[PDB]
Design a protein around this ligand. Structure first.
Ligand SMILES: O=C(NO)c1cccc2ccccc12
Ligand SMILES: [Zn+2]
Length: 206
């Protein structure tokens, strides 16, 4: 059993409905890490993500490196974001995705605060590099993003970093799905009851 975990950061946004339709058309489930301001602007998309079998988790309020890590606001922001999501879907998610990744921002003390707050942390195993092709022609960029993902996929479990707020990322998803299905991956959402650690610190507590 090989499982691919597509994860989408920084939304919701104006390409998210299209992404959801694409995922549904391929019966794929994915994971979304949402920014609080966008949760407030797009509550219907938050509802739809959760209703259609995807995992909805937190990606902070400010996405501000200095505030989250140096000033130590990571857990406070994730808790605030958690509440905004819970207001819509009636569930308080536990999984967080650190802006800029956990390394080196989430130091010793912050990782303890995460655990003590009942949160988990997922980084990723495959970076799609989708930001490299920002503002480039969409279909060509998508093909390049798909090959970035497809070649890096080797392990039984892969967690793939993408951003649904960018057109070229959403456009890459059909080719990614096809390419990974051929290699025997199934596409699942994150599952709180089935947590396994995926973080740059190899901290098995989060
Ligand atoms: O937060 C991120 N993913 O959404 C993220 C991870 C790693 C590096 C970054 C650099 C600039 C902006 C964001 C990131
Ligand atoms: Zn981000």
């Amino acid at each position: 059993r090989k499982v691919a975990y597509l994860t989408f950061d920084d939304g919701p946004g104006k390409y998210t409905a299209e992404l959801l339709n694409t995922l549904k058309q391929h019966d794929a489930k994915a994971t979304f890490f949402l920014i609080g301001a966008n949760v407030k602007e797009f509550p219907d998309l938050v509802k739809r993500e959760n209703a259609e079998g995807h995992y909805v988790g937190m990606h902070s309020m400010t996405h501000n490196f200095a505030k989250l890590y140096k000033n130590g606001e990571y857990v406070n922001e994730m808790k605030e974001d958690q509440g905004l999501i819970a207001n819509i879907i009636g569930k308080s998610p536990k999984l967080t995705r650190p802006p800029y990744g956990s390394m080196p921002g989430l130091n010793e003390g912050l990782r303890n605060k995460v655990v003590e707050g009942g949160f988990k942390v997922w980084d990723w195993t495959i970076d799609s590099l989708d930001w490299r092709y920002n503002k480039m022609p969409v279909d060509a960029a998508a093909a390049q993003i798909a090959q970035n993902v497809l070649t890096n996929a080797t392990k039984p479990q892969e967690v793939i970093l993408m951003h649904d707020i960018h057109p070229q990322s959403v456009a890459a998803v059909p080719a990614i799905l096809k390419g990974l299905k051929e290699k025997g991956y199934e596409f699942e959402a994150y599952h709180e009851e089935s947590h396994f650690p995926v973080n740059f610190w190899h901290d098995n507590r989060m």
